[model samples]
Target: AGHMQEAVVKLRVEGMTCQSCVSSIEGKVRKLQGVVRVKVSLSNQEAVITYQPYLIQPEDLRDHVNDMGFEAAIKS
Candidate 1:
């Protein structure tokens, strides 16, 4: 068998005003099965997430943040 498809994606997240916003995103993302790591920067206004690509797509990560009422996009 092959190794896990660990993938890292950077997403531009808008409207993150404080620590609560960062915590909210990080907390939920950490609960996702395929997620390996979760980092959200309110100062930088972006999110860096690592997950199993075979289980989750980049767009799915972005969309999940979008559903949280924040604007998320993969601009790269």
Candidate 2:
């Protein structure tokens, strides 16, 4: 549950509507190369992503969302 240099970000997402949206986003994001965990929020158009930044950059996570049927940005 911990690492030397882990990363976490609140990513802003768009095009979520129902359970299918978050459900879809969650698993796929969790499947990404360096993703440690993910939670896609249909409640607020945002997601929590914890990853190994050493394996993948934040920019890499953002664009991968577009390919996952929506879009996301690793927000501030």
Model 1 agreement with the true structure over 1-70: per-residue lDDT tens digits: 4865688887787666754767776787756776677887777788788877778776666656666687
Report the C-alpha displacement of residue 13, candidate 2, in angstroms. 2.0
- Each prediction's RMSD over C-alphas, in Å, is 2.4, 2.7
Candidate 2 vs. true structure, TM-score: 0.72
TM-score of every model versus the real structure: 0.72, 0.72
lDDT of the candidates, in the order given: 0.73, 0.73
- For model 1 the local lDDT of residue 3 reads 66
